[PDB]
Design a protein around this motif. Structure first.
Motif, PDB file in Angstrom:
ATOM      1  N   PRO C  74     -61.900  40.522 -99.698  1.00 41.21           N
ATOM      2  CA  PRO C  74     -62.718  39.699 -98.997  1.00 41.21           C
ATOM      3  C   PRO C  74     -63.144  37.787 -99.761  1.00 41.21           C
ATOM      4  CG  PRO C  74     -64.297  41.390-100.719  1.00 41.21           C
ATOM      5  CD  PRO C  74     -62.727  41.226-100.502  1.00 41.21           C
ATOM      6  N   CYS C  75     -62.494  38.034-100.332  1.00 40.65           N
ATOM      7  CA  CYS C  75     -62.786  36.582-100.795  1.00 40.65           C
ATOM      8  C   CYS C  75     -62.573  35.190 -99.328  1.00 40.65           C
ATOM      9  CB  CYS C  75     -62.683  35.829-101.690  1.00 40.65           C
ATOM     10  SG  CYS C  75     -63.234  37.111-103.161  1.00 40.65           S
ATOM     11  N   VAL C  76     -62.466  33.685 -99.371  1.00 36.16           N
ATOM     12  CA  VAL C  76     -61.614  32.708 -98.734  1.00 36.16           C
ATOM     13  C   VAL C  76     -60.606  32.755 -99.126  1.00 36.16           C
ATOM     14  CG1 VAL C  76     -62.578  31.064-100.496  1.00 36.16           C
ATOM     15  CG2 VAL C  76     -62.524  30.615 -97.958  1.00 36.16           C
ATOM     16  N   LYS C  77     -59.850  32.634 -98.116  1.00 42.19           N
ATOM     17  CA  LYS C  77     -58.548  32.278 -97.787  1.00 42.19           C
ATOM     18  C   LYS C  77     -57.925  30.780 -98.526  1.00 42.19           C
ATOM     19  CE  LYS C  77     -57.243  36.582 -97.304  1.00 42.19           C
ATOM     20  NZ  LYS C  77     -58.684  37.343 -97.523  1.00 42.19           N
ATOM     21  N   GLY C 249     -68.618  28.506 -92.817  1.00 46.31           N
ATOM     22  CA  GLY C 249     -69.243  29.757 -94.166  1.00 46.31           C
ATOM     23  C   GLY C 249     -67.902  29.963 -95.162  1.00 46.31           C
ATOM     24  N   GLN C 250     -67.454  28.576 -95.141  1.00 39.39           N
ATOM     25  CA  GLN C 250     -65.947  28.609 -96.054  1.00 39.39           C
ATOM     26  C   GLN C 250     -65.973  27.511 -97.123  1.00 39.39           C
ATOM     27  OE1 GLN C 250     -65.152  29.358 -93.125  1.00 39.39           O
ATOM     28  NE2 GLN C 250     -66.022  31.248 -93.129  1.00 39.39           N
ATOM     29  N   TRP C 251     -66.289  27.646 -98.276  1.00 45.30           N
ATOM     30  CA  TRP C 251     -65.998  26.993 -98.943  1.00 45.30           C
ATOM     31  C   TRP C 251     -64.920  26.555-100.388  1.00 45.30           C
ATOM     32  CZ3 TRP C 251     -69.560  22.965 -99.183  1.00 45.30           C
ATOM     33  CH2 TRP C 251     -70.287  23.129 -97.998  1.00 45.30           C
ATOM     34  N   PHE C 252     -64.027  26.064-100.441  1.00 42.89           N
ATOM     35  CA  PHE C 252     -63.263  25.431-101.793  1.00 42.89           C
ATOM     36  C   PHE C 252     -64.071  24.680-103.040  1.00 42.89           C
ATOM     37  CE2 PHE C 252     -60.225  22.543-103.350  1.00 42.89           C
ATOM     38  CZ  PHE C 252     -59.229  23.641-104.055  1.00 42.89           C
ATOM     39  N   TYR C 253     -63.871  25.445-104.090  1.00 44.77           N
ATOM     40  CA  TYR C 253     -63.615  24.800-105.077  1.00 44.77           C
ATOM     41  C   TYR C 253     -62.809  24.166-105.599  1.00 44.77           C
ATOM     42  CZ  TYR C 253     -67.654  27.219-104.173  1.00 44.77           C
ATOM     43  OH  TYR C 253     -68.807  27.919-102.869  1.00 44.77           O
ATOM     44  N   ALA C 254     -63.615  22.587-106.053  1.00 45.79           N
ATOM     45  CA  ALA C 254     -62.050  21.277-106.845  1.00 45.79           C
ATOM     46  C   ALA C 254     -62.971  20.915-107.859  1.00 45.79           C
ATOM     47  CB  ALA C 254     -62.130  20.468-106.016  1.00 45.79           C
ATOM     48  N   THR C 255     -61.609  20.972-108.745  1.00 47.51           N
ATOM     49  CA  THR C 255     -62.000  20.559-109.971  1.00 47.51           C
ATOM     50  C   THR C 255     -63.088  18.735-109.803  1.00 47.51           C
ATOM     51  OG1 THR C 255     -60.622  21.925-111.482  1.00 47.51           O
ATOM     52  CG2 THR C 255     -61.010  19.734-111.644  1.00 47.51           C
ATOM     53  N   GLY C 256     -63.547  18.210-109.426  1.00 48.83           N
ATOM     54  CA  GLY C 256     -64.384  17.117-109.428  1.00 48.83           C
ATOM     55  C   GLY C 256     -63.687  15.977-110.592  1.00 48.83           C
TER      56      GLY C 256
END
Ligand SMILES: *[C@@H]1O[C@H](CO)[C@@H](O[C@@H]2O[C@H](CO)[C@@H](O[C@@H]3O[C@H](CO)[C@@H](O)[C@H](O)[C@@H]3O)[C@H](O)[C@H]2NC(C)=O)[C@H](O)[C@H]1NC(C)=O
Ligand SMILES: *[C@@H]1O[C@H](CO)[C@@H](O[C@@H]2O[C@H](CO)[C@@H](O[C@@H]3O[C@H](CO)[C@@H](O)[C@H](O)[C@@H]3O)[C@H](O)[C@H]2NC(C)=O)[C@H](O)[C@H]1NC(C)=O
Ligand SMILES: *[C@@H]1O[C@H](CO)[C@@H](O[C@@H]2O[C@H](CO)[C@@H](O[C@@H]3O[C@H](CO)[C@@H](O)[C@H](O)[C@@H]3O)[C@H](O)[C@H]2NC(C)=O)[C@H](O)[C@H]1NC(C)=O
Ligand SMILES: *[C@@H]1O[C@H](CO)[C@@H](O)[C@H](O)[C@H]1NC(C)=O
Ligand SMILES: *[C@@H]1O[C@H](CO)[C@@H](O)[C@H](O)[C@H]1NC(C)=O
Ligand SMILES: *[C@@H]1O[C@H](CO)[C@@H](O)[C@H](O)[C@H]1NC(C)=O
Ligand SMILES: *[C@@H]1O[C@H](CO)[C@@H](O)[C@H](O)[C@H]1NC(C)=O
Ligand SMILES: *[C@@H]1O[C@H](CO)[C@@H](O)[C@H](O)[C@H]1NC(C)=O
Ligand SMILES: *[C@@H]1O[C@H](CO)[C@@H](O)[C@H](O)[C@H]1NC(C)=O
Ligand SMILES: *[C@@H]1O[C@H](CO)[C@@H](O)[C@H](O)[C@H]1NC(C)=O
Ligand SMILES: *[C@@H]1O[C@H](CO)[C@@H](O)[C@H](O)[C@H]1NC(C)=O
Ligand SMILES: *[C@@H]1O[C@H](CO)[C@@H](O)[C@H](O)[C@H]1NC(C)=O
Ligand SMILES: *[C@@H]1O[C@H](CO)[C@@H](O)[C@H](O)[C@H]1NC(C)=O
Ligand SMILES: *[C@@H]1O[C@H](CO)[C@@H](O)[C@H](O)[C@H]1NC(C)=O
Ligand SMILES: *[C@@H]1O[C@H](CO)[C@@H](O)[C@H](O)[C@H]1NC(C)=O
Ligand SMILES: *[C@@H]1O[C@H](CO)[C@@H](O)[C@H](O)[C@H]1NC(C)=O
Ligand SMILES: *[C@@H]1O[C@H](CO)[C@@H](O)[C@H](O)[C@H]1NC(C)=O
Ligand SMILES: *[C@@H]1O[C@H](CO)[C@@H](O)[C@H](O)[C@H]1NC(C)=O
Ligand SMILES: *[C@@H]1O[C@H](CO)[C@@H](O)[C@H](O)[C@H]1NC(C)=O
Ligand SMILES: *[C@@H]1O[C@H](CO)[C@@H](O)[C@H](O)[C@H]1NC(C)=O
Ligand SMILES: *[C@@H]1O[C@H](CO)[C@@H](O)[C@H](O)[C@H]1NC(C)=O
Ligand SMILES: *[C@@H]1O[C@H](CO)[C@@H](O)[C@H](O)[C@H]1NC(C)=O
Ligand SMILES: *[C@@H]1O[C@H](CO)[C@@H](O)[C@H](O)[C@H]1NC(C)=O
Ligand SMILES: *[C@@H]1O[C@H](CO)[C@@H](O)[C@H](O)[C@H]1NC(C)=O
Ligand SMILES: *[C@@H]1O[C@H](CO)[C@@H](O)[C@H](O)[C@H]1NC(C)=O
Ligand SMILES: *[C@@H]1O[C@H](CO)[C@@H](O)[C@H](O)[C@H]1NC(C)=O
Ligand SMILES: *[C@@H]1O[C@H](CO)[C@@H](O)[C@H](O)[C@H]1NC(C)=O
Ligand SMILES: *[C@@H]1O[C@H](CO)[C@@H](O)[C@H](O)[C@H]1NC(C)=O
Ligand SMILES: *[C@@H]1O[C@H](CO)[C@@H](O)[C@H](O)[C@H]1NC(C)=O
Ligand SMILES: *[C@@H]1O[C@H](CO)[C@@H](O)[C@H](O)[C@H]1NC(C)=O
Lengths: 111, 426, 417, 116, 368, 103
Positions: C74-77, C249-256
């Motif tokens: 169920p996690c964001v693609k 409602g979809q988020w990507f978590y990037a290295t900042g």
């Protein structure tokens, strides 16, 4: 064989009642549903025998007199000259009465 | 006298339950259960093949199983684009003029950016104008590619009773589908039915043992299908004489589309061959039996399927996964009175709205090399249109293809408890 | 004599069944292990055990894989990120190591966004692509779901029992003459690793060398230690997380990154490691030669998950260099190991699927226990790899599942009416 | 629970109250399937005892004589030195014979009761 | 003197279980079993049963199951992904009196190419150089016309081993030692009508003020009337719709006051007033097939909203299709007075206040 | 279909079969049916471990200890319902079960 002698007369077929008694319990979701149903049907029949004075017998005698209104035939016309398939049809309108009477016959023995 | 309770009593009633299958690919990995008849002496039982719940259940399981497969496969919605085409007209027999087309288009690739130009071959039946074309079923529905790893070859499926139930089998040699059956036996499972899908003619089923049997519901009523079970079989030799190649196109992140590639050697038309003399005797037998219901020297004539769609008006095969539609008007052309081979041309189609549905479409991947198959005609489906009665090929309702094997079987439930008067008291 | 029927007869057969998970009460193991959780000694019982043929291992393997997928399903693609990527370099206060590392990449996603990647996450063709982009589309793991291992107890359903071997010297096969029955196994932590087995059980005595066939030399050797070896691991780079919206409602978590850029690493002591190998060679010498020489060396080759110590801590995925270990010859202070990191992860052997591990804000401080090793005229031994079944074999090692068969008969001096 | 499992049949002849009357104790479909099977096994054993001529009791003796060809052993070993585990192995492929005979005997007893 | 064991013992305890429903409606695939034509209600002579409408799992169960069914539907309907585009839009001057907007946009077709220009109408409440409300925040799923959401009556029935008890005390205030208790197998229809400030249809008290800890806190008061009030609600617009293709079989359907019966509303209030002293979502929602959000005008003028965030959730916006081209007030939800409510559990607490679920425990012991 | 209600103990002795017969009559419903079966079987197994089976009324040789309830036979059996009795002896039950299992 299972239902062997199904066309035989009443009382002949009954010589081997273990055969049809021991063989009642033998997406894939249907197999689970089928297992559950087989158990439920089995238990409903065992509870019914056990709510009467019957337990482990295949030929349980109970204290309920036979009514001529259910069927009035010579004893030889019950235990010969006819099989269980016609008999079941013949008294299908009284089964629920007999069962209620059997239950009470046993309640009357709880002394 | 007195009531006595008996348990294990050999009686039953008609019943509707859920059967499970067993067997000795779509079905091979479905049943997952490995695979003795008991004769019932002096038992007469009533059968009715037209009210047989197993037919509805087999249909339900086939559709569900069919859809369980395909679901986890590559979708072809990225191909619903405007495409351009020309005709091949290259080393053809002149009987394929405009039948096979050379198409090209702009489609997606591995990345969300960029694009690729590809080309492929299509059969005319799959493509419509809008040199500018659209694929069929981009109009409505959506196309899903069948997974090449999955075989659709029918294998025998044995339907088995759940505990507490039994299946009764009718053995009367001339049983016509309804009414009392004299020779009855009890089985745990069916004989193994191959889920063959066809129309008009019934392929690879059971044969009659003595004579042709005509089975129908209220036969006097026209506009009903008649199922004819044959004595002996008619052998059919089918071929698709085109040595095909395939093109594997990556359309996304491990998403593959299998396009029809080019043809090695000459391009030839697909067709099926039936022995002519065999067909002639086969019909003579059918006509003689039809005369029992349509007698007094009524002239019986056969005619073609007439109007309707491709699925109903032509014969349909599934050979190696290839889908053939064949013209049977060359078979159903005769007049019968009381006094070497036939070649049926065929067409090939890849985008299929299977099971008379409109919300789904399957894409049949192409098959490499040259494919042929040999099948047995074990029966016919006829429809009847006052003298000179006329019969035409009928069909399209898939349940009729299963009644032809399931007519001998009935499901009953066991109710091993009852009472009778006896001489005992407690 | 007459036939007598008995019920409740204390006998059993080898069996395979479905076991259930239990524990001692947003962790995935806990979420799907919701049953809370004595031992009976069997006097005069000999039982055959075989840990190389043990369906508890296979069942655990399946449960681990299944749970993992249920968690990610169920996690964001991250499909929106497979675009040609434009990458350059980072020269911002990096020490001498890691030069070929931390590339700064920009995306055409419309919006222009950027993120940092490890070198092992990308490939060329300044034109880059993500690994597992051409195949195996990537799913981002949910940041709220913890995969931290917790002890798992496997428990028998009614009608079944689990037998366990108490013999301190058991080598995995053959009869055991000290057997007891339990309802549940001890808790096992579902720790994932290669080469070194972390946070498991210690041997009661000495060092135990186990294999299916010790002279085959084409099988893994599982080595269990009676004492732990401590490993101190860290990723001291004070990372930042950058939240990028990719949809409604979809988020990507990037290295900042805050402070100096340093190489991730793990430490063990010299003395502990040397003594540990000493004990291992003493036991290897009971099977391999006599007046011989035992040498240790690093991996002969293989993929990253084979040649390095696959290690997971803090939720980060490390691939540590163990060549600083296993480099000695045995005859009759500290060690520091550098580590590499990846964010795009192919779990197990599932080449066709991939997961993106979100970055961890801050730093990692981690301490783990080495409880065992997987190894593969003089002889040389090297660290080996596996498919994880071999790791679970080390904890499910002592257990067998049997079915109880309460009915049976015997002749007796009794006849009823 | 399986205490004294390695003890002799004799020693264990009085331990049958244990390992008994405890089988109903308290994707995810696999656990539902496990629960159903536990019930099926419970009922299968109870039905089998019920079809035979004695149930309820932990120890039931019947009117089927012991046939020496099923063991070729006697009480110098049986109920003395042998354990239940060894015993189960020694007669492991005669089980179906015994069971068929037990059912036949009770079916005759039922007829006798119907006539009486 | 001796211990006697009994089996069919007439004993029960408070219990929490799952009840099932019994009767192209959305509940058609749920309430798949009809109820009996004969409820077979059994009066329990000489008993007292503690009932409590608060902390009642039947209410909670009704709520979670309705949400689930609601979400099971919609799931297979068209997802309106391509409506999150810049919308151009103007006003309406066509026989309009003291609204609706005239809007247009660039939309997809059944093919991936050849994008089309589309003209459609919108209500002001759904439009925020315009964008649709919340389009960039939550996915919007349309409620496809093949399924009806009409609130047919439903009945909750006990599973084997359980029974439903009912309170027949006409003065019951929602809690306490109710007498004249009866046993049933299934509940009454408890029609699942969704509203805010006023409770519509359901049943009458034949007035009872019911609340938890009345006068002491900020809690809702559920007022059940002895008489119903009819409200005449209409939408006098004669709207038409345009069906367009978004994708390959993906169809999108593009594009008011209540008269409170006079005098009887004041009589109804008359019955409530001075009963409160014995102790002592700004609008009224509806579903007519459309959601009205009516003002309390003369109560203590409606507006249709098409994009709906229901059940107090954010990420599941629903798109109600337009519809081409008469309710009873049976109770009120009040707050300390002004209308209260908005919590669906209270909406569904009503009508279930009289029911309790108990487990049958058929085993017990007594001396002999 | 229980109508014994507030009738006193001993009045319901003839309705015992009314309650017993009512016990045996998407995934959530499959689970519910299985659980109903398990509840039934647990009660039957429990009666079976005790010295009886197949009875509505069972009385094995376990003596009553008045410490469990300081009332005589007329005081307990009559003038009370089963609900009231069960509450008064909600404790001291597992002990009986143990004694019944032992005999
Ligand atoms: C009626 O039954 C016959 C068999 O009795 C069916 O024909 C057979 O179909 C299978 C699958 O399409 C063929 O197998 C394939 O053979 C090629 C040979 O090179 C191989 O490369 C493939 O991997 C596969 O094994 C089989 O050869 C063929 N038999 C004959 C005689 O041609 C027939 O299709 C059935 N009728 C219907 C309508 O299904
Ligand atoms: C082997 O077992 C040890 C514990 O016995 C595991 O170490 C623990 O790892 C977790 C996750 O990295 C640490 O949790 C974090 O703690 C900080 C404390 O400030 C908190 O801010 C974070 O939010 C998080 O909760 C935990 O502290 C640490 N335990 C100890 C004693 O240091 C180790 O990871 C296991 N090894 C393997 C390979 O599984
Ligand atoms: C309170 O109960 C009343 C009925 O007593 C509900 O009003 C009724 O609602 C249904 C469903 O919307 C209407 O049926 C529909 O009629 C149209 C034709 O006008 C047809 O196309 C539809 O397919 C459907 O059959 C019914 O006519 C209407 N009754 C009246 C008198 O107009 C009312 O909605 C309930 N209140 C609440 C808040 O639920
Ligand atoms: C069928 O009837 C014949 C008549 O002679 C009889 O001998 C035979 O046993 C009967 N079959 C069955 C099943 O009883
Ligand atoms: C037969 O039925 C009548 C009622 O129709 C009843 O009065 C009589 O007692 C019954 N006799 C027997 C033997 O049950
Ligand atoms: C692909 O797009 C370009 C755009 O200029 C067009 O010229 C070309 O004909 C298209 N090709 C195909 C096969 O559709
Ligand atoms: C398919 O396209 C043709 C184009 O002329 C159209 O007439 C037909 O109605 C479309 N099919 C369906 C199901 O609407
Ligand atoms: C076709 O019929 C012949 C007999 O004429 C038979 O031997 C053969 O097995 C049949 N083939 C199939 C596929 O049933
Ligand atoms: C089938 O046989 C039954 C026997 O009663 C007869 O009534 C029916 O008309 C026959 N139907 C056909 C098609 O032969
Ligand atoms: C059979 O068909 C004839 C056609 O005229 C019709 O009159 C008759 O009612 C039908 N009978 C049945 C049983 O369907
Ligand atoms: C079909 O092929 C077989 C050989 O496999 C041949 O004997 C038969 O005559 C052919 N039938 C026709 C109609 O050509
Ligand atoms: C088929 O039957 C007709 C009957 O008139 C005959 O003329 C023709 O020659 C026959 N064909 C074959 C192949 O036997
Ligand atoms: C049937 O034959 C007629 C002869 O004129 C032809 O026009 C028609 O297209 C044929 N139909 C089929 C389905 O073969
Ligand atoms: C184990 O066997 C020895 C004899 O070898 C015996 O003395 C001892 O009592 C047995 N243990 C048990 C628990 O019976
Ligand atoms: C990045 O810079 C380092 C020196 O700081 C250099 O060694 C490395 O090759 C550079 N990377 C690329 C891709 O040029
Ligand atoms: C794509 O990347 C190039 C890099 O030079 C940039 O100039 C262009 O504006 C980007 N396009 C988008 C849509 O961001
Ligand atoms: C079994 O273990 C105990 C300690 O746990 C030990 O004293 C005993 O000697 C062991 N027996 C065997 C056979 O190893
Ligand atoms: C590591 O070893 C030490 C040794 O004293 C022990 O106390 C600690 O609990 C062990 N930690 C783990 C994770 O096993
Ligand atoms: C491990 O075994 C060795 C064997 O020589 C022993 O000296 C050492 O003390 C043991 N250590 C532990 C923790 O048991
Ligand atoms: C394990 O110990 C047993 C003891 O009988 C021995 O036969 C077996 O060969 C040993 N296996 C290995 C791999 O050491
Ligand atoms: C162990 O490996 C050797 C290698 O030569 C082989 O010969 C032997 O058969 C193997 N034994 C077993 C039990 O696998
Ligand atoms: C490893 O040892 C080095 C020695 O210089 C030290 O600086 C470093 O902090 C140690 N790492 C850990 C994780 O303790
Ligand atoms: C050789 O084996 C014996 C045991 O059989 C052992 O005591 C001795 O230490 C071994 N020698 C060497 C060099 O390891
Ligand atoms: C580690 O492996 C590499 C090859 O992968 C080799 O060149 C290097 O010498 C090895 N290091 C040690 C300590 O053996
Ligand atoms: C099982 O059957 C085989 C048949 O050869 C026999 O040798 C063996 O002894 C039998 N098992 C037992 C326990 O007697
Ligand atoms: C559609 O796109 C064109 C691109 O030139 C733009 O001019 C037009 O205003 C857009 N239409 C709408 C309704 O947004
Ligand atoms: C409203 O109440 C009246 C009785 O006052 C009743 O007849 C009518 O059916 C009710 N209407 C609704 C929608 O319940
Ligand atoms: C009602 O609320 C007040 C708030 O101060 C509290 O003190 C009182 O105990 C509450 N009473 C009940 C019955 O909950
Ligand atoms: C409300 O009252 C007005 C009075 O003029 C009337 O025109 C209107 O139709 C009424 N509305 C309804 C819904 O009956
Ligand atoms: C109802 O209309 C009045 C008109 O003055 C307005 O002030 C009030 O806020 C409106 N109420 C609601 C809930 O919109």
């Amino acid at each position: 064989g299972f239902l062997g002698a199904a066309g035989s007369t009443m009382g002949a077929a009954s010589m081997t009642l273990t055969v049809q008694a021991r063989n009642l319990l033998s997406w894939g979701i249907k197999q689970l549903q089928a297992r559950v149903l087989a158990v439920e049907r089995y238990l409903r029949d065992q509870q019914l025998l056990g709510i009467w004075g019957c337990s482990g017998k295949l030929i349980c005698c109970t204290n309920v007199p036979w009514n001529s209104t259910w069927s009035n035939r010579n004893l030889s016309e019950i235990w010969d000259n006819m099989t269980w398939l016609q008999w079941d049809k013949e008294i299908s309108n009284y089964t629920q009465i007999i069962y209620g009477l059997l239950e009470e016959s046993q309640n009357q023995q709880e002394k | 006298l007195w009531v006595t309770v008996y348990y294990g009593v050999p009686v039953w009633k008609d019943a509707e339950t859920t059967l499970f299958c067993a067997s000795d690919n779509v079905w091979a990995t479905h049943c997952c259960v490995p695979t003795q008849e008991i004769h019932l002496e002096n038992v007469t039982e009533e059968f009715n093949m037209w009210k047989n719940n197993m037919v509805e259940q087999m249909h339900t399981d086939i559709i569900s199983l069919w859809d369980q497969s395909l679901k986890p496969c590559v979708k072809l919605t990225p191909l619903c684009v405007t495409l351009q085409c020309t005709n091949v007209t290259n080393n053809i027999t002149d009987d394929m003029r405009g039948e096979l087309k050379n198409c090209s288009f702009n489609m997606t690739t591995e990345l969300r950016d960029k694009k690729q130009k590809v080309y492929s071959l299509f059969y005319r039946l799959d493509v419509v104008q809008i040199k500018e074309y659209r694929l069929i079923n981009c109009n409505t529905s959506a196309i899903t590619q069948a997974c090449p790893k999955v075989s659709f070859e029918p294998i025998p499926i044995h339907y088995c009773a759940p505990a507490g139930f039994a299946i009764l089998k009718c053995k009367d040699k001339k049983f016509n589908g309804t009414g009392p059956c004299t020779n009855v036996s009890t089985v745990q499972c069916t004989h193994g039915i191959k889920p063959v899908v066809s129309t008009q003619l019934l392929l690879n089923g059971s044969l009659a043992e003595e004579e042709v049997i005509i089975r129908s519901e209220n036969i006097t009523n026209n506009a009903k299908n008649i199922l004819v079970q044959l004595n002996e079989s008619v052998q059919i030799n089918c071929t698709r004489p085109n040595n095909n190649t395939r093109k594997s196109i990556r359309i996304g992140p491990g998403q593959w589309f299998y396009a029809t590639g080019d043809i090695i050697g000459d391009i030839r038309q697909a067709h099926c061959n039936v022995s002519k003399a065999t067909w002639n005797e086969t019909l003579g037998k059918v006509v003689k039996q039809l005369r029992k219901h349509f007698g007094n020297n009524t002239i019986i004539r056969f005619a073609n399927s007439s109007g309707g769609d491709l699925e109903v008006t032509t014969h349909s095969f599934n050979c190696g996964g290839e889908f053939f539609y064949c013209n049977t008007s060359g078979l159903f052309n005769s007049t019968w009175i009381s006094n070497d081979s036939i070649t049926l041309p065929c067409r090939i189609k890849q985008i299929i709205n299977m099971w008379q549905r409109i919300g789904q479409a399957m894409y049949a991947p192409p098959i490499q090399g040259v494919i042929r198959c040999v099948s047995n005609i074990t029966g016919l489906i006829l429809t009847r249109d006052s003298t000179t009665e006329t019969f035409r090929p009928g069909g399209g309702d898939m349940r009729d293809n299963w009644r032809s094997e399931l007519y001998k079987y009935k499901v009953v439930k066991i109710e091993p408890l009852g009472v009778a008067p006896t001489r005992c008291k407690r």
